Amino acid sequence: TKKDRVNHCLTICENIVAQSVRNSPEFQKLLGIAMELFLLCSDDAESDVRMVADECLNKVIKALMDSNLPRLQLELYKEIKKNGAPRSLRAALWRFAELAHLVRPQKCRPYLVNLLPCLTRTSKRPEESVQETLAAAVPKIMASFGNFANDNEIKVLLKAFIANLKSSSPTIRRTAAGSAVSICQHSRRTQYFYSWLLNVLLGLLVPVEDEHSTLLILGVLLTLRYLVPLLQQVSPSAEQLVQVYELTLHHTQHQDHNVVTGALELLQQLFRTPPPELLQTLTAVGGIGQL
Protein backbone atom coordinates (compact mmCIF):
# COMPACT_ATOMS: atom_id res chain seq x y z
CA THR A 1 0.00 0.00 0.00
CA LYS A 2 3.11 2.19 0.12
CA LYS A 3 2.92 2.82 -3.63
CA ASP A 4 -0.86 3.12 -3.30
CA ARG A 5 -0.55 5.88 -0.70
CA VAL A 6 2.00 7.80 -2.78
CA ASN A 7 -0.05 7.41 -5.96
CA HIS A 8 -3.36 8.25 -4.26
CA CYS A 9 -1.95 11.45 -2.75
CA LEU A 10 -0.23 12.30 -6.04
CA THR A 11 -3.53 11.67 -7.85
CA ILE A 12 -5.32 14.18 -5.61
CA CYS A 13 -2.19 16.34 -5.86
CA GLU A 14 -2.61 16.96 -9.59
CA ASN A 15 -6.42 16.78 -9.46
CA ILE A 16 -6.86 19.72 -7.08
CA VAL A 17 -4.41 22.03 -8.89
CA ALA A 18 -5.64 21.16 -12.41
CA GLN A 19 -9.26 22.16 -11.86
CA SER A 20 -11.00 24.96 -13.75
CA VAL A 21 -13.36 26.13 -10.99
CA ARG A 22 -11.77 27.26 -7.71
CA ASN A 23 -14.82 28.61 -5.86
CA SER A 24 -17.47 25.90 -6.22
CA PRO A 25 -18.93 24.70 -2.89
CA GLU A 26 -17.68 21.16 -3.54
CA PHE A 27 -14.18 22.53 -4.19
CA GLN A 28 -13.98 24.07 -0.71
CA LYS A 29 -14.93 20.77 0.92
CA LEU A 30 -12.62 18.80 -1.38
CA LEU A 31 -9.71 21.18 -0.73
CA GLY A 32 -10.08 20.67 3.01
CA ILE A 33 -10.04 16.89 2.60
CA ALA A 34 -7.06 17.10 0.25
CA MET A 35 -5.30 19.48 2.64
CA GLU A 36 -5.71 17.34 5.76
CA LEU A 37 -4.68 14.20 3.86
CA PHE A 38 -1.30 15.76 3.02
CA LEU A 39 -0.68 16.68 6.67
CA LEU A 40 -1.71 13.15 7.66
CA CYS A 41 0.49 11.77 4.88
CA SER A 42 3.30 14.08 6.04
CA ASP A 43 3.98 11.73 8.99
CA ASP A 44 4.42 8.23 7.55
CA ALA A 45 6.97 5.53 8.25
CA GLU A 46 8.24 5.48 4.66
CA SER A 47 10.47 8.47 4.01
CA ASP A 48 9.67 8.73 0.29
CA VAL A 49 6.00 9.04 1.24
CA ARG A 50 6.94 12.11 3.28
CA MET A 51 8.97 13.95 0.63
CA VAL A 52 6.03 13.44 -1.73
CA ALA A 53 3.24 14.50 0.64
CA ASP A 54 5.05 17.69 1.66
CA GLU A 55 6.16 18.46 -1.91
CA CYS A 56 2.52 18.38 -2.99
CA LEU A 57 1.58 20.17 0.23
CA ASN A 58 3.20 23.39 -0.98
CA LYS A 59 2.63 22.69 -4.68
CA VAL A 60 -1.10 22.93 -3.97
CA ILE A 61 -0.49 26.02 -1.83
CA LYS A 62 1.54 27.81 -4.51
CA ALA A 63 -1.12 27.15 -7.16
CA LEU A 64 -3.94 28.24 -4.82
CA MET A 65 -2.01 31.01 -3.05
CA ASP A 66 -4.29 33.60 -4.71
CA SER A 67 -7.68 31.99 -5.30
CA ASN A 68 -8.10 30.13 -2.00
CA LEU A 69 -5.48 31.39 0.48
CA PRO A 70 -8.04 32.08 3.27
CA ARG A 71 -9.20 28.46 3.05
CA LEU A 72 -5.61 27.19 3.11
CA GLN A 73 -4.84 29.27 6.21
CA LEU A 74 -7.87 27.81 7.98
CA GLU A 75 -6.84 24.25 7.13
CA LEU A 76 -3.22 24.83 8.15
CA TYR A 77 -4.30 26.34 11.47
CA LYS A 78 -6.78 23.53 12.17
CA GLU A 79 -3.83 21.13 12.12
CA ILE A 80 -1.83 23.28 14.54
CA LYS A 81 -4.88 23.55 16.81
CA LYS A 82 -4.97 19.75 17.21
CA ASN A 83 -1.60 19.09 18.83
CA GLY A 84 -0.55 15.89 17.07
CA ALA A 85 2.52 14.07 15.84
CA PRO A 86 5.71 16.18 15.84
CA ARG A 87 6.32 15.82 12.10
CA SER A 88 2.74 16.67 11.08
CA LEU A 89 2.39 19.61 13.47
CA ARG A 90 5.74 21.09 12.43
CA ALA A 91 4.69 20.51 8.81
CA ALA A 92 1.60 22.67 9.25
CA LEU A 93 3.32 25.16 11.57
CA TRP A 94 6.18 26.05 9.22
CA ARG A 95 3.72 26.63 6.35
CA PHE A 96 1.23 28.72 8.33
CA ALA A 97 4.07 31.05 9.31
CA GLU A 98 5.09 31.46 5.66
CA LEU A 99 1.56 32.39 4.58
CA ALA A 100 0.90 34.48 7.70
CA HIS A 101 1.91 37.77 6.05
CA LEU A 102 -0.64 37.23 3.25
CA VAL A 103 -3.61 37.53 5.62
CA ARG A 104 -5.56 40.75 5.19
CA PRO A 105 -5.61 43.09 8.21
CA GLN A 106 -9.34 42.55 8.73
CA LYS A 107 -8.58 38.90 9.58
CA CYS A 108 -5.38 39.41 11.59
CA ARG A 109 -7.15 39.86 14.94
CA PRO A 110 -9.29 36.66 14.91
CA TYR A 111 -6.29 34.57 13.85
CA LEU A 112 -4.07 35.96 16.61
CA VAL A 113 -6.68 35.24 19.28
CA ASN A 114 -7.04 31.65 18.08
CA LEU A 115 -3.28 31.26 17.65
CA LEU A 116 -2.29 32.48 21.13
CA PRO A 117 -3.08 29.12 22.82
CA CYS A 118 -1.41 27.26 19.94
CA LEU A 119 1.87 29.14 20.35
CA THR A 120 1.87 28.63 24.12
CA ARG A 121 0.83 24.98 23.85
CA THR A 122 3.40 24.19 21.16
CA SER A 123 6.12 25.71 23.36
CA LYS A 124 5.45 22.91 25.86
CA ARG A 125 6.28 20.25 23.26
CA PRO A 126 9.67 18.74 24.24
CA GLU A 127 10.71 17.57 20.76
CA GLU A 128 13.85 19.29 19.50
CA SER A 129 12.36 19.35 15.98
CA VAL A 130 9.06 20.98 16.97
CA GLN A 131 10.92 23.68 18.89
CA GLU A 132 13.12 24.42 15.87
CA THR A 133 10.04 24.89 13.68
CA LEU A 134 8.38 27.09 16.32
CA ALA A 135 11.63 29.05 16.65
CA ALA A 136 11.09 30.21 13.07
CA ALA A 137 7.29 30.36 13.10
CA VAL A 138 7.04 32.86 15.97
CA PRO A 139 8.95 35.74 14.28
CA LYS A 140 6.93 35.33 11.08
CA ILE A 141 3.59 35.12 12.90
CA MET A 142 4.34 37.99 15.29
CA ALA A 143 5.54 40.24 12.46
CA SER A 144 2.08 39.87 10.91
CA PHE A 145 -0.15 39.52 14.00
CA GLY A 146 1.80 41.27 16.76
CA ASN A 147 0.26 44.72 16.32
CA PHE A 148 -3.22 43.20 16.81
CA ALA A 149 -2.41 41.99 20.34
CA ASN A 150 -3.49 43.38 23.68
CA ASP A 151 -0.81 44.43 26.15
CA ASN A 152 -1.66 41.52 28.45
CA GLU A 153 -1.75 39.05 25.54
CA ILE A 154 1.92 39.78 24.81
CA LYS A 155 2.60 39.19 28.51
CA VAL A 156 0.90 35.78 28.28
CA LEU A 157 3.15 34.67 25.43
CA LEU A 158 6.29 36.09 27.06
CA LYS A 159 5.60 34.32 30.36
CA ALA A 160 5.00 31.07 28.46
CA PHE A 161 8.35 31.31 26.68
CA ILE A 162 10.26 32.53 29.75
CA ALA A 163 9.22 29.32 31.51
CA ASN A 164 11.27 27.42 28.90
CA LEU A 165 14.47 29.34 29.69
CA LYS A 166 15.48 26.81 32.37
CA SER A 167 15.04 23.76 30.11
CA SER A 168 17.94 21.35 29.73
CA SER A 169 17.70 21.15 25.94
CA PRO A 170 19.63 24.01 24.27
CA THR A 171 17.16 23.92 21.37
CA ILE A 172 14.30 24.57 23.78
CA ARG A 173 16.49 27.02 25.69
CA ARG A 174 17.37 28.91 22.49
CA THR A 175 13.91 28.86 20.92
CA ALA A 176 12.54 30.50 24.08
CA ALA A 177 15.17 33.25 23.93
CA GLY A 178 14.53 34.02 20.27
CA SER A 179 10.75 33.92 20.51
CA ALA A 180 10.59 36.10 23.63
CA VAL A 181 12.72 38.83 22.05
CA SER A 182 10.88 38.63 18.73
CA ILE A 183 7.47 38.80 20.45
CA CYS A 184 8.40 42.14 22.03
CA GLN A 185 9.92 43.43 18.78
CA HIS A 186 6.66 42.98 16.85
CA SER A 187 4.31 44.25 19.58
CA ARG A 188 2.51 47.59 19.66
CA ARG A 189 4.51 49.02 22.58
CA THR A 190 7.97 47.83 21.57
CA GLN A 191 9.85 50.04 24.04
CA TYR A 192 7.49 49.22 26.92
CA PHE A 193 7.89 45.46 26.47
CA TYR A 194 11.65 45.81 26.01
CA SER A 195 11.78 47.35 29.49
CA TRP A 196 9.21 44.85 30.77
CA LEU A 197 11.24 41.92 29.46
CA LEU A 198 14.51 43.44 30.67
CA ASN A 199 13.47 43.65 34.33
CA VAL A 200 11.84 40.21 34.21
CA LEU A 201 15.05 38.70 32.85
CA LEU A 202 17.08 40.71 35.37
CA GLY A 203 14.76 39.70 38.20
CA LEU A 204 15.51 36.09 37.32
CA LEU A 205 19.21 36.69 38.08
CA VAL A 206 19.70 40.12 39.72
CA PRO A 207 19.85 38.35 43.12
CA VAL A 208 23.42 37.61 42.08
CA GLU A 209 24.70 36.27 45.41
CA ASP A 210 22.03 33.57 45.70
CA GLU A 211 22.40 30.36 43.71
CA HIS A 212 20.90 30.15 40.22
CA SER A 213 20.51 27.14 37.95
CA THR A 214 23.19 26.96 35.26
CA LEU A 215 20.44 26.09 32.78
CA LEU A 216 18.53 29.24 33.75
CA ILE A 217 21.70 31.34 33.56
CA LEU A 218 22.41 30.18 30.00
CA GLY A 219 18.81 30.82 28.95
CA VAL A 220 18.69 34.37 30.28
CA LEU A 221 22.16 35.32 29.03
CA LEU A 222 21.15 34.19 25.54
CA THR A 223 17.88 36.13 25.73
CA LEU A 224 19.73 39.33 26.63
CA ARG A 225 22.08 38.77 23.69
CA TYR A 226 19.07 38.63 21.37
CA LEU A 227 17.64 41.76 23.02
CA VAL A 228 20.78 43.93 23.11
CA PRO A 229 20.79 44.88 19.38
CA LEU A 230 17.11 45.89 19.53
CA LEU A 231 17.82 48.23 22.48
CA GLN A 232 19.89 50.54 20.24
CA GLN A 233 16.97 52.98 20.04
CA VAL A 234 8.36 54.03 29.34
CA SER A 235 11.59 52.52 28.00
CA PRO A 236 14.64 50.64 29.31
CA SER A 237 16.72 52.95 31.49
CA ALA A 238 20.46 53.33 31.98
CA GLU A 239 20.04 51.73 35.41
CA GLN A 240 18.60 48.59 33.81
CA LEU A 241 21.29 48.50 31.11
CA VAL A 242 24.16 48.91 33.58
CA GLN A 243 22.59 46.14 35.67
CA VAL A 244 22.76 43.86 32.63
CA TYR A 245 26.40 44.83 32.11
CA GLU A 246 27.17 44.07 35.77
CA LEU A 247 25.36 40.74 35.43
CA THR A 248 27.51 39.88 32.41
CA LEU A 249 30.78 40.73 34.15
CA HIS A 250 29.94 38.56 37.17
CA HIS A 251 29.05 35.51 35.07
CA THR A 252 32.34 35.58 33.14
CA GLN A 253 33.86 34.32 36.42
CA HIS A 254 31.59 31.26 36.53
CA GLN A 255 33.01 27.74 36.70
CA ASP A 256 30.99 26.28 33.82
CA HIS A 257 32.67 27.10 30.51
CA ASN A 258 29.23 27.10 28.86
CA VAL A 259 28.17 29.92 31.19
CA VAL A 260 31.50 31.69 30.66
CA THR A 261 31.19 31.52 26.88
CA GLY A 262 27.49 32.36 27.09
CA ALA A 263 28.11 35.54 29.07
CA LEU A 264 31.17 36.44 26.98
CA GLU A 265 29.01 36.30 23.85
CA LEU A 266 26.57 38.71 25.50
CA LEU A 267 29.45 40.99 26.51
CA GLN A 268 30.65 41.35 22.92
CA GLN A 269 27.07 41.88 21.72
CA LEU A 270 26.85 44.73 24.23
CA PHE A 271 30.05 46.27 22.88
CA ARG A 272 29.18 45.74 19.20
CA THR A 273 25.79 47.52 19.41
CA PRO A 274 25.81 49.39 22.74
CA PRO A 275 22.67 51.24 23.79
CA PRO A 276 23.47 54.96 23.91
CA GLU A 277 22.63 55.34 27.61
CA LEU A 278 24.92 52.46 28.61
CA LEU A 279 27.70 53.61 26.26
CA GLN A 280 27.82 57.03 27.93
CA THR A 281 28.01 55.33 31.32
CA LEU A 282 30.76 52.92 30.23
CA THR A 283 32.87 55.76 28.82
CA ALA A 284 32.49 58.36 31.59
CA VAL A 285 35.35 58.46 34.09
CA GLY A 286 32.85 58.03 36.88
CA GLY A 287 30.47 55.66 35.13
CA ILE A 288 28.71 53.41 37.62
CA GLY A 289 29.83 55.10 40.85
CA GLN A 290 27.34 57.87 40.13
CA LEU A 291 24.56 55.31 39.65
From Swiss-Prot:
Q: Which residues carry this modification: N6-acetyllysine?
A: K82, K140
What tissues contain this protein? Expressed in the brain cortex (at protein level). Widely expressed with the highest level of expression in the brain (nerve fibers, varicosities, and nerve endings). In the brain, the regions where it can be mainly found are the cerebellar cortex, the neocortex, the striatum, and the hippocampal formation.
Q: Enumerate the transmembrane spans.
A: none
UniProt HEAT repeat ranges: 110-147, 152-189
Q: Domain text from the record? A: The N-terminal Gln-rich and Pro-rich domain has great conformational flexibility and is likely to exist in a fluctuating equilibrium of alpha-helical, random coil, and extended conformations.
- Which family does this protein fall into? Belongs to the huntingtin family.
Medical condition linked:
Huntington disease: A neurodegenerative disorder characterized by involuntary movements (chorea), general motor impairment, psychiatric disorders and dementia. Onset of the disease occurs usually in the third or fourth decade of life. Onset and clinical course depend on the degree of poly-Gln repeat expansion, longer expansions resulting in earlier onset and more severe clinical manifestations. Neuropathology of Huntington disease displays a distinctive pattern with loss of neurons, especially in the caudate and putamen. Lopes-Maciel-Rodan syndrome: An autosomal recessive neurodevelopmental disorder characterized by developmental regression in infancy, delayed psychomotor development, severe intellectual disability, and cerebral and cerebellar atrophy. Additional features include swallowing problems, dystonia, bradykinesia, and continuous manual stereotypies without chorea. Some patients manifest seizures.
Describe its partners and assembly state: Interacts with PFN1. Interacts through its N-terminus with PRPF40A. Interacts with PQBP1. Interacts with SETD2. Interacts with SH3GLB1. Interacts with SYVN. Interacts with TPR; the interaction is inhibited by forms of Huntingtin with expanded polyglutamine stretch. Interacts with ZDHHC13 (via ANK repeats). Interacts with ZDHHC17 (via ANK repeats). Interacts with F8A1/F8A2/F8A3. Found in a complex with F8A1/F8A2/F8A3, HTT and RAB5A; mediates the recruitment of HTT by RAB5A.
Please state what the protein is called. Answer: Huntingtin
- Which species? Homo sapiens (Human)
Kindly list the organism's lineage: Eukaryota, Metazoa, Chordata, Craniata, Vertebrata
